Amino acid sequence: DENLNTLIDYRFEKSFRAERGQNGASRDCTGKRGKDVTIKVPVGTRVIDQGTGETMGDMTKHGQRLLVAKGGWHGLGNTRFKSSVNRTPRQKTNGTPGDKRELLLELMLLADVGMLGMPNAGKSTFIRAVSAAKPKVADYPFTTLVPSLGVVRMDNEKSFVVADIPGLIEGAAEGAGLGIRFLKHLERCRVLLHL
Amino acid sequence: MRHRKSGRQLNRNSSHRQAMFRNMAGSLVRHEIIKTTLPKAKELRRVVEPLITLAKTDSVANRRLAFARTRDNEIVAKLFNELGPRFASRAGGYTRILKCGFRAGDNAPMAYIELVDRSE
Amino acid sequence: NIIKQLEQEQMKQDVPSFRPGDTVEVKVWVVEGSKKRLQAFEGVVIAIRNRGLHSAFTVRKISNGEGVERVFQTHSPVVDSISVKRRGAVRKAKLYYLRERTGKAARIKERLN
Amino acid sequence: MIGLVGKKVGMTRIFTEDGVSIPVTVIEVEANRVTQVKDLANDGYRAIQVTTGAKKANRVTKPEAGHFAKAGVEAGRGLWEFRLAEGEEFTVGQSISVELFADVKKVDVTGTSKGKGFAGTVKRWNFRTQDATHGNSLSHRVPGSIGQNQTPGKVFKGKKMAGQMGNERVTVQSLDVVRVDAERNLLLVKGAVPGATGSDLIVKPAVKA
Amino acid sequence: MIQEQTMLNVADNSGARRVMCIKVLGGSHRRYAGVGDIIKITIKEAIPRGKVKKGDVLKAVVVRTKKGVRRPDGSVIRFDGNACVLLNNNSEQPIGTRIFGPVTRELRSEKFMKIISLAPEV
Amino acid sequence: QGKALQDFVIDKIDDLKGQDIIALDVQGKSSITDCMIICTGTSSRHVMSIADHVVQESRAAGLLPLGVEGENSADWIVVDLGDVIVHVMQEESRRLYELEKL
RNA sequence: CACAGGUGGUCAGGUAGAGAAUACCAAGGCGCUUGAGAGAACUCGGGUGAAGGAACUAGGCAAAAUGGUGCCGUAACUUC
RNA sequence: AAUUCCUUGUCGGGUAAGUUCCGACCUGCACGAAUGGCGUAAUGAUGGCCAGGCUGUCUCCACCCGAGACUCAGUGAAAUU
RNA sequence: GAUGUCGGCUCAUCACAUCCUGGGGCUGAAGUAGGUCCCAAGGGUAUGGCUGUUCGCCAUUUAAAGUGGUACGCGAGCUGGGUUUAGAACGUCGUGAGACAGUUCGGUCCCUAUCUGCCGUGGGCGCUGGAGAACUGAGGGGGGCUGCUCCUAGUACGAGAGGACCGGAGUGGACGCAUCACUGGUGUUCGGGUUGUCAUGCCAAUGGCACUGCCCGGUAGCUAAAUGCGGAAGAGAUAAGU
RNA sequence: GACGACGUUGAUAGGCCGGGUGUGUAAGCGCAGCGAUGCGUUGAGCUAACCGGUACUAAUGAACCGUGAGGCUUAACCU
């Protein structure tokens, strides 16, 4: 979906259940198939499995559908195993089990303007001057821990999305602080404002 | 279901009803006294009395129209000449019904119907 | 008797008499909710049900290659003026057979009177 | 307050200034005269007995003649009772006019609907006619099944089948009144009321909102 | 009226010629479609070069009815032929660029101004 | 209101930067209105903003619009101001729907 | 059974019709050994029906529809 | 397949949607060459499918015309118990 | 010693282990929308293609297209498609007669209601002199469904997208009641056109028959597809809960 | 069955008059045309169940059933 641009709804990693397939009833009554389960996902997410995992597919445009786990096959009843050899089939086949899969979703920032500055710079307070987002602002280093979004709408027709990024220190290059991993949410912004 | 409906069926279709009334209407005026069942007599007045009223005025058109009913020239001949002057000074009620009990064959309500004076 | 009191007191006394099968212009009042304007409707009348205040007549129009039939109430205030240009010559009260035959093959005649 | 009792004379449309046609029912109401007034001490409930129209002297028998003479009222077609509304009062012999319906703007009409005689299941209870083809034999408008197998072993009360339909008291609620006439004694009510032309109707102010 | 499995003409130049009203929208047990209604149609005859193809399923708006349209003064608006305007499935907007034939005023009441505006009649 | 709503609508549309304002005096060709105004919209959001602006000012003026159509889709939205229909549509919609016929 | 069944041969009018079909009649013979009422549900035999036209149903079952003469014209296939 | 349990085999046509039908593949439980194999014009009160007209088959039944049903008069059963 | 079976149609009723509407608790409940659990049976709870199918898959709606009982409800209510006596054929088995929880084509569904039951409608008597009316109400029955739009409000919430609770007003779907004022249907009792034939002595003009001979309209009545109304608000005591 | 209205001191039903409705220019006469046919008389004739009036006809004087003051005890008043 184009509307979504965050994964806050999947940071609690709920267990999504596709209902048990209806058991075959007597008198040649075929059970109903379980209804499909659709999970709302933003555009641009990366799909990774745990254990020999690969990128199954990349979200491209709105409405694109990706198959992640195919449902189990139905269990054939005794009607399907009658022949001349055996005329009263007592054998029953269990339905093939569903796919138990671990999914990792990686999303990059969709903002148009990205900020990079020292913790002493007013990156967070600049969002307040350009938008109404209310991030945490204070007089101490590393006030913000995760990137936050903001939209600058001065006119109804035209607007752009600007995101503030947590500050980085002299030693952030090699690590030992917050690292350089929060610059991964870049290369998508059209312009990178520097404070 | 007979709401504001008139016209009895008499266990006959439209063709038989029209012919039976036509034959009975000519017979009644020819003799001035006939004996028939109560329902037949009561619906006969809705035939002969309009015919007499038409016969009150004598014209080539009326006689031809009167000939279209009862399909008999002699009946038309007696009308416009005999029953015309007698009923000229009368406004309706040319016929009256006299109940006379029941038949011995089928036990049906029997009644005579005749003209007003009959000149007898 | 009692009904006829409301019948007479509500009918219009300026209704023209038009024969079935004539070409009639009907001026109706159409409302958009703000302004009242007159809409014309030209066609040949095919059926008249003249019964007291409930009198009505059916007129037919061939517009854009499609036949449209519309009824009007002779005593309703929705109509404004009824006029006749050409008087048809048909010996039938109802002109329902015009629906089947095409207009070019259904040219009506004038009464010449 | 109370209502009136009258006779339906027919139905007619009403044309408004904007062209909208309102189909109304014309009800004539004669000036009802109160024959009795009831009290808690005697009957335990408050009501007034009224009459309308006129009845022939020969047809009127002595018992009701004394009933009319006691109240000083002439003969009437019938008698009815209307329940009072805890504060309104009427006196014996007072004539009831129609102009009191100039503010109710909502009336309830009760009357005996048309008699349709012995009606079938399809006509009365709006059942579904079975198929007229595909081998169907002597069963088109029949009701069909009328119960389950021997476990109930009976037919429940209130089961829908053929019977006498109509010719019973029917109430139509929340009927708009269009116009009321005093000098002509006419009441114009929007919509259709139960009963045939000439039948007696009872009109009352609406009880619902 | 207009019900399912009904042959329908077209009042626009989208490209279809004959469609099938095969499902009427509005609620459960919907029996009929009036003069202004949303119905589901399938294309039964269309121009090969038109904007729509054969067998497509989409939404349509009734324009003209055989039975007629009841005016508040006991006046009916009859027609010779049943016609509709084709609409997109997701958004109820006209597909054709023109309307051919007369259109009743009732579409104005139900806020269908696209058909009324570009219709050279009532 | 007559001959004054013509200038009132043009002022309101031009107040929000409408482009290529055209007024069609359809006195008798159309049986629903007296005049028509067609205006262009730069983008999808602009078309909705123009439509909301003209409707909102009309309510304050004293005329309630009879309805609008192009709400979900901003390709073409219409406003019914009684005797006047005002169309505001995108750049593409003014050629697919050629409104020079009336 | 005074039974809506079955039983061979001969005579073969007029009109319209190709005709022993069919419709009305001629000569001739009959009104079919229970009638009289009212016009409830429902059953049977029929007529018509707004809009849709098989959406009914196992199934276009039944109904509905076509139906004649003259002229023009008439496909795949084929043992021509 | 009049022959296939697995089977609604797989693909395509027809339909918005086709366990039926038609066209290709052969994994023929369990076709097969006078207990004849394949094709075949015409024919069929033969089986299956689709299209056009037509319609109360249906949505959804309504009214009407006759014969019973109902009442009166006369005659007057039956199964079952 | 016997049609009696599955499916479909008509008609339903009951239970709640509740599909929707109703009232809530928790939430990994920002909002809309969801997850789970409790109370709640008043009402409602789809149309088609395939197959005989119940069941299913598919297409498209709805708030939902609930789960079960009632001889897997209902054939002295209907259907006879499935299966299936007598015919025939294919595959297989057996030398064969024949057979096959293998397939294919065709193949009689009777009953006038005695009793209980139910739907309506009467007679007798009683209610303590008789009679004519009009009512209170002990009790019983019917109905109780809900979509969409607007204001509140683009407000609360939300960075934006998106988008409220409560309350109020309209407008629809299905169901029921009533009516014929309008639109229609029917209207073999009204008028007219027309074919064949016979009759009225003949022309003209009519009548009989041919499905009302075939048609065109159409009075009243009846009727729906037509138009009016209704589902309540409120009061008392409560379930879960606060 | 039953319910409702009326029975001469009556509009209950039928008939009649007027009106409405429906159909559509009746028959006859003469003219034009050889004829079919059209024209003026003419929106004529006819018109069921619908509306308003009208005793012209049918709802007869009657007779039948249904009674003659309505049980006992006690309680509150009236003599």
Ligand SMILES: Nc1nc2c(ncn2[C@@H]2O[C@H](COP(=O)(O)OP(=O)(O)NP(=O)(O)O)[C@@H](O)[C@H]2O)c(=O)[nH]1
């Ligand atoms: N007067 C003034 N003070 C400012 C301005 N900008 C920042 N400051 C002050 O300097 C402080 C810097 O903190 P802040 O802006 O929150 O830093 P930050 O953008 O959050 N960076 P980080 O997330 O890494 O901590 C502010 O809290 C405020 O007190 C400015 O324009 N004017």
Ligand SMILES: [Mg+2]
């Ligand atoms: Mg910061």
Ligand SMILES: [Mg+2]
């Ligand atoms: Mg504004």
Ligand SMILES: [Mg+2]
């Ligand atoms: Mg919007």
Ligand SMILES: [Mg+2]
């Ligand atoms: Mg917004």
Ligand SMILES: [Mg+2]
């Ligand atoms: Mg909104």
